[PDB]
Amino acid sequence: SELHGYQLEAVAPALRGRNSIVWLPTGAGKTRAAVHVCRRHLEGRRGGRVAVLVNKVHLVQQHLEKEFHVLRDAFKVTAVSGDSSHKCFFGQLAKGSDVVICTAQILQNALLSGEEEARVELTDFSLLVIDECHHTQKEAVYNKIMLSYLQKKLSGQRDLPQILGLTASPGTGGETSFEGAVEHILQICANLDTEVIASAQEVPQPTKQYDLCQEREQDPFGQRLKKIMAQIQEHMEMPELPQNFGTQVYEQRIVELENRAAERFCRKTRVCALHLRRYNDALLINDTVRMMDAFQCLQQFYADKKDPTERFLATTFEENRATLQALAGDQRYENPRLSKLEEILQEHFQPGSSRGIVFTKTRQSAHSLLSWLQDTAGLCGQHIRAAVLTGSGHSNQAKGMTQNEQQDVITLFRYGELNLLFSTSVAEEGLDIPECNIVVRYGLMTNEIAMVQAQGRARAQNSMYSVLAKANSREVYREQLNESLVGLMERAIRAVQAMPERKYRLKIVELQRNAVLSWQVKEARSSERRQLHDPDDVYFHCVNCNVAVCRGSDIRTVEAMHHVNINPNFRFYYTVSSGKIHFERTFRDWEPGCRIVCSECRQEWGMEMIYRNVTLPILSIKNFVVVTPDEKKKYKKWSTVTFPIEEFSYLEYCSSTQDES
RNA sequence: GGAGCGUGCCGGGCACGCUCCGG
Ligand SMILES: Nc1ncnc2c1ncn2[C@@H]1O[C@H](COP(=O)(O)OP(=O)(O)O)[C@@H](O)[C@H]1O
Ligand code: ALF
Ligand SMILES: [Mg+2]
Ligand SMILES: [Zn+2]
Structure with missing residues (x-):
């Protein structure tokens, strides 16, 4: 499969040596386009060295095996791996390669290094390929690397690498006006030192559906947690305590109270606040997955437990434990989110052929959905072979998945040894599964970039995309707004593309100058705060x-x-x-x-x-x-x-x- | 499991996530 017309067209500026962003839809094949740029770049001058930056561990291997490996006929291509059993420093690896593929922080570490074997400069590369380049904003590592590039550019540093940004979705950065969105596009161009945003001016998409679910008619499990939470707050004997149980606002307020109590050493307040946070976590779990998942959150907290406050709390849980468990086993009070998800999977995994990703917020949630699916009799004999996919994030509540563990699930998913993933945001961008034909986004509150990207994992002809959310919720609103923000983003990109060169150039120089100045002010501010006390x-x-x-x-x-x-x-x-x-x-x-x-x-x-x-x-x-x-x-x-x-x-x-x- | 960052949320915080830790 040689390049499509649109691919060649999108990389014409890059082939002439111009810094660019390739803006092409999800799954359009930006990666293979970029490989072609690297081939002609490396051919067109000896001494060239390419760094290919990605933002997810598994994309390093994916990009090598499915695209960049074809350069090995004539060039040395190295994929950075945290699993190498012959580890050396980055500088050595890169300096001995024509193309280096790594997560951006690997390069940033080398760019800041003290030791001479690991040290690298931007001038040691002639081309930087920045995948998912919309992350080149704020203080993300992509932007830290490029802010250094700008600093050097503005001081007259010569032979800085060419920049090739790849993205489907620059986004609007929260802006909802045309003027705002245009300014955001210019800020992205400024950050990446872009001369041209190249697109297909001269790829199937999924049918979208909202799978709305209603509030639980009866929620005696949640109601009982709320009663207990009221009891603990009465025992605290404090006026003006929040009453909005089962909300992220209550979560914040109760932890803030916990911190103030820690600061004044108010032991009874602090410990009660601690436990109340746990009850609130259980309500959120109850609203997202099963009652029994919420019960296990509380049970494991109290199983690992004297002081009269802490024994009042142990006693209070114990008094309700059995009732909470029995309620949790009752099919009558099932989560309508889960009923709706069962309907979706029942309908699309009959007859094996369907290949789905269900996106969820937390690592814990992904594991709980898998257990739910495995315990659901209505989904048996549908040949659903499911697994969890998370990134390398880690916490007491939920450990991560290593590079190899991720790759194992992905490789089985690729040809259907597994046919359903419960995934965190780890797989929303970049992941290429040509046979994936269903994406479900389960109660998510994200920006429009995450929406566009996650949808895009459904690569197949006749793909489906489901928004599974509570009717009349903020989730539904934000999804609808995000859809309009994609259209606005596109309008904004076209306006920047048609901008008179002279006006565009003046605007880029201005934004770049302000960027490098704002960094200096931020740095000075951080240093001053750090020097306040002996x-x-x-x-x-x-x-x-x-x-x-x-x-x-x-x-x-x-x-x-x-x-x-x-x-x-x-x-x-x-x-x-x-x-x-x-x-x-x-x-x-x-x-x-x-x-x-x-x-x-x-x-x-x-x-x-x-x-x-x-x-x-x-x-x-x-x-x-x-x-x-x-x-x-x-x-x-x-x-x-x-x-x-x-x-x-x-x-x-x-x-x-x-x-x- | 320490750090870096981002996303969501609240008037500097809260929560979650990803990434880094010889590649
Ligand atoms: N010219 C082409 N002919 C056939 N397949 C292609 C071509 N270019 C890209 N592909 C394939 O299209 C799929 C999506 O490409 P990918 O680079 O992941 O898209 P994105 O632009 O979102 O990064 C990959 O499986 C890739 O190998
Ligand atoms: F880079 Al994509 F879907 F836009 F993998
Ligand atoms: Mg891609
Ligand atoms: Zn102590």
Whole structure:
């Protein structure tokens, strides 16, 4: 299959060496077009080196095996893999290759590197191909790489690589006016240093349907959770507490209350707020999947549990546990979201032939939908072979899927060994399954880019796209708005394409200049906030029992990421709990040791890091209240702390530790 | 499981997600 006319046309500017964005519909074959650009680019001058940037782990392998491998007749093409069992540094890999395919953060790491073997410059490439280039916005890695490109361009750096952006959907960036949308397109062009947006000016699409579901007539499971939540809030004895149970707003307010209580050391308020968040999580789960999924959320929280507040809460759950379980087994109170999804799958998987992705928000939700499908008698004998697909995201609630684990599911899905995926947003862009003919979006609240992309996974002739949402909801509204935003985005792109060259050029220079200036201001602002306090005047307190445990001056950063306490006497404040934590990925310089906890109350603090031949405690900031002479604050991220932290030195630490004994 | 980022949401937060951690 040689290139279609539209492909050749879309890459004509790139073939003349112009920076461009190729804007072609989902599944139009932007990738093969880009490969052709790389072939002629590399042919047209020796010494050329191409970087192909992607934004999902599995796209590295997909792009190699289905497209970029054809360049191996004449050129060396390397796909970066986190699973290589002969690992070297990026610079070595890239400098010894004609084409390097990697996730963008791999390149950004190399572009910022200290060590000489790993270091790379933008000038070491003659072409950057940026897949799904609509992510080249704000502080995403695509935009960090390109902001550096702009800085260099504006200072008169020469032989910067050519830029080839690929996307189906620049988006409108929240803008709902023509003027706004046009400005957003220009901002994307500015970010990517685009000379021309090239399209097919001179690919089937699915029939779309709204599968609306009504609120549950009777929800005694949810009602009972709400009654319990009211009881806990009465026990807290506080006026003006929120009543809007089962909402993300209540979730926010109750965690904010939890944080204020942590900051003032209000133990009873904080612990009750903690548990209330869990009950609220259960309501959200109840509204999204099965009652029993919501029950298991609460049950696992209380199974792993003295203090009279915490025993009041244990007692309160125990008093309702059996009733909650029995209600959860009752077919009468089934989730209409799930009934609707059953109808859809019953209709489209009769007779095997259908090849579907059901998109859901959370990793947990994907797993719960699979279990639901496997427990649903109405869907048996339909030859539905389903699996979960998630990305590499990870949390206590739900672990991720590694590169290989993702690839295993995708490869079986490709020819129908599996015929249905329950997927997170990991598979909304880029994934190419020619036989996929059904996409269902299950109660999602996304922008128009995610809508267009997810729809686009249905590659087949006569594909179907279903919006499964609650009737009269914000989800339905946002889907309808998003549809109009696609049309508006298209209008905006056409206006930028027809813009007088001189007016376009002046506008790009202006946006680029403002971008590089705004970055400098943001950087200076971040530095000032970081220098507000002497580290010696910052104390860390255990969030549970409020005991003082270390100071800011005890903290160092290992590998510009991991915040460790280097004080030899800090070991008297934490206790190591048995059980080595195991990650799937093994690192070069370290592995995780055991979890650490507060030695005076057993509150979780973080974990051991076995860094070369020493063991260092990593402190997770969320388990502490940070106290300065001005305020007490609960932090989510280390990056918002207002004292400076020095980089860890291994040599200096080893030297100082071998003094006492 | 630490970090980076994004999306949704609320008047700087909340939630979720993806990515990085020798490729
Ligand atoms: N000229 C062509 N002839 C036949 N098939 C093609 C051609 N160009 C691309 N394809 C195929 O079309 C499918 C979609 O291409 P892909 O690059 O994933 O689309 P996107 O533009 O969304 O990245 C792939 O299976 C690809 O191999
Ligand atoms: F790049 Al696409 F669907 F637009 F994989
Ligand atoms: Mg693609
Ligand atoms: Zn403690």
